Amino acid sequence: PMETQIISDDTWKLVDEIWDKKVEEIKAEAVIQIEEEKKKPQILMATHFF
């Protein structure tokens, strides 16, 4: 053998980071995605007139 180490140990840290960010984003997206209170028409826009 003659080949020493290759790309890095820090690039593995970066790819672990992006893996964890995507996993956490999926985890957050799965459970807090749907919540609805109301969508009422805003047809008394008083800040234009009153």
């Binding site: 109301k38 969508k39 009422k40 028409p41 805003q42 047809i43 008394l44 826009m45 800040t47 234009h48 007139f49 009153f50």
Partner: protein, 132 residues
């Protein structure tokens, strides 16, 4: 109900109130207006109810006082009742043409200027006082 209806004397006394059929509507609609105002204050108002809120304000402004003072409405109060509604329905068209719909969007809280509520009520009451 039947002895109320087919009694001619209740027909003499209940048709005795048709002289104020103009005053049945102009006050009965005010209760609907204030009820819809409270419902919108809670946050559950359809488009018709908010239209009825501005209609209640605008009609109760323009048409009621001269009808109260002279007993006959003919001419300028009618056309200014039309003109006021034609005036206020102008943010709706501009904010619908260059938009998807009338739904409030997301923005920063500091952008819209607020003003103390007592002054707003004072403005409305002064507008009423000046119109009467």
């Amino acid at each position: 109900t039947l002895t109320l209806v087919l009694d001619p004397f209740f027909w003499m006394y209940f048709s005795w109130t048709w002289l104020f059929w103009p005053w049945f509507i102009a006050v009965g609609l005010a209760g609907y207006g204030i009820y819809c105002f409270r419902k919108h204050w809670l946050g559950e108002a359809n488009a018709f109810e908010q239209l009825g809120i501005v209609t209640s304000v605008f009609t109760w402004l323009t048409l009621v006082p001269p009808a109260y003072f002279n007993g006959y409405l003919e001419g300028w109060p009618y056309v200014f009742f039309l003109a006021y509604h034609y005036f206020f329905f102008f943010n709706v068209s501009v904010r619908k043409r260059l938009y998807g719909d009338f739904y409030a969007r997301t923005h920063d809280p500091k952008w819209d200027v607020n003003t103390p509520l007592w002054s707003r009520i004072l403005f409305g009451v002064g507008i009423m006082v000046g119109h009467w």
